[PDB]
Amino acid sequence: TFLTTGQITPEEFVQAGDYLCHMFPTWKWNEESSDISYRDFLPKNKQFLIIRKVPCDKRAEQCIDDIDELIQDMEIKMAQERYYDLYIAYSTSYRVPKMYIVGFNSNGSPLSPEQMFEDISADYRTKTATIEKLPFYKNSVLSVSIHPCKHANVMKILLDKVRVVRQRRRKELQEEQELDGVGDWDSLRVDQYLIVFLKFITSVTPSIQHDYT
């Protein structure tokens, strides 16, 4: 399972994508366009996820329990202002999702690669972010991609930490029930994979508004 490896199959990528778009209407699957370079192991209308123009107020320089809370809650259900389009695509080399961000200034002018790195937290640059063309377009655009598995298997680490927290919380609860004599009075599914992935993304790009969470 994905909890053991921290990796998913294209089918699991689809479920997670659907869940993400269902819980956060702002996210959407790609439409079917002629300018897209389709991958056969994924339905044509579910190649990648996109969220448009997420605002960025400050640079990165200035700027686990939350995830669990958010996941639980969902189970219940310089000065320049910048805007970033965020793409989540599936990486076949690591069987993990991968994000691509494309920045713009208020006028809609694309920000250069160097400018976008100002929005990547210094603590994640070298082993997480690099410059590359969006891989899903025939005539592509430049962007900064954020990878979760080049060094540390981030998804794996995060999913484990989340389970540890839950196990502790569940046992601490039973212990408090015995202590208070009221003892006589949620698992992680692949659907929530991308939500954990976005938590990771939030640490990597701290100045990007949480309009995707």
Technique behind this structure? X-ray
Can you name the residues that pair with 146 across neighbouring β-strands? 99, 129
Q: How long, in residues, is the chain?
A: 213
Written as one letter, the residue type at 180 is D
Phi/psi at 98 (5° precision): -150, 135
Q: How far is CA 153 from the centre of its chain?
A: 14
Instruction: Provide the sign of the torsion angle of the four alpha carbons 205, 13, 162, 4, taken in this order.
Output: negative
Q: Are 188 and 163 in contact (CB under 8 A)?
A: yes
How far the first Cα of the chain sits from its last, in Å, is 25
Resolution (A): 2.5
**At 103, which helix (H) or strand (E)?**
strand 96-105
Q: Are 39 and 47 in contact (CB under 8 A)?
A: yes
DSSP state of 150: S
CA-to-CA distance for 21 and 7, rounded, in angstroms?
Answer: 20
* Active-site residue flag, 63: no
CA-to-CA distance for 209 and 213, rounded, in angstroms?
Answer: 9
Under DSSP, is residue 141 helix (H, G, I), strand (E, B) or coil? coil
